[PDB]
Amino acid sequence: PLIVPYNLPLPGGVVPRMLITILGTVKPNANRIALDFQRGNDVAFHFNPRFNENNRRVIVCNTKLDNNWGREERQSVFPFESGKPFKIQVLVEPDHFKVAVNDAHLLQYNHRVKKLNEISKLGISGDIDLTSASYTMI
Numbered sequence: 001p002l003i004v005p006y007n008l009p010l011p012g013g014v015v016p017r018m019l020i021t022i023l024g025t026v027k028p029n030a031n032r033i034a035l036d037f038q039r040g041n042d043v044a045f046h047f048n049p050r051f052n053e054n055n056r057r058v059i060v061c062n063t064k065l066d067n068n069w070g071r072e073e074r075q076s077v078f079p080f081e082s083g084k085p086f087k088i089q090v091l092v093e094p095d096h097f098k099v100a101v102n103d104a105h106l107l108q109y110n111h112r113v114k115k116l117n118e119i120s121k122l123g124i125s126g127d128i129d130l131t132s133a134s135y136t137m138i
């Protein structure tokens with residue numbers, strides 16, 4: 001087991017062809033999960049499954065600059081399930097982060113923070129038991 005919130009350093013920042021894989025299990029009474037790719041205090045890519053936003057399950061994605069959240073990108077496809085194991089894969093492509101959950105493509109998030117090699121940490125938080133968090137080049 002890995003302790004949550006967990007920080008995964010991304011040495012030298014992200015680059016296209018970098019694949020991040022996260023394995024965990026959603027807790028039974030889950031409310032929220034967050035992945036935060038950070039550039040110092042800024043959040044280049046926030047990926048945030050919400051299990052009960054006005055009785056809806058939604059994934060909210062956004063960027064935080066100078067402590068301000070920007071325009072949200074919302075996805076109603078919701079592949080997480082309370083109490084169940086999951087795999088998140090985040091592939092850095094030249095123009096977007098590409099996310100798959102349990103081997104099925106979920107969404108893409110266009111790069112708003114363009115200094116990719118300054119996105120040096122990934123935070124993992126929320127209502128999960130975290131099994132593994134790693135990266136490799138494809």
Ligand SMILES: Cc1nc([C@@H]2O[C@H](CO)[C@H](O)[C@H](n3cc(-c4cc(F)c(Cl)c(F)c4)nn3)[C@H]2O)n(-c2cc(Cl)ccc2C(F)(F)F)n1
Pocket residue numbers: 032033034046048060061062069070071072125126127
């Ligand atoms: C109801 C709600 N939620 C938000 C924020 O939405 C952001 C995405 O647009 C982020 O999701 C933001 N957020 C979530 C979390 C968070 C913290 C945690 F510790 C965990 Cl474990 C987690 F899963 C998420 N921290 N910040 C969350 O507070 N709102 C918001 C959205 C925008 Cl675009 C601007 C301002 C806000 C507000 F937070 F209200 F000020 N409104």
